[PDB]
Amino acid sequence: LXXXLXLXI
Numbered sequence: 001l002x003x004x005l006x007l008x009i
């Protein structure tokens, strides 16, 4: 999901 929407996971 986009790396947790931007969390980078």
Ligand SMILES: *C(=O)C[C@H](O)CCCCCCC
Binding pocket: 001, 002, 003, 004, 005, 009
């Ligand atoms: C989107 O961000 C793809 C990621 O690789 C997987 C996210 C998994 C969410 C489950 C952990 C809360």
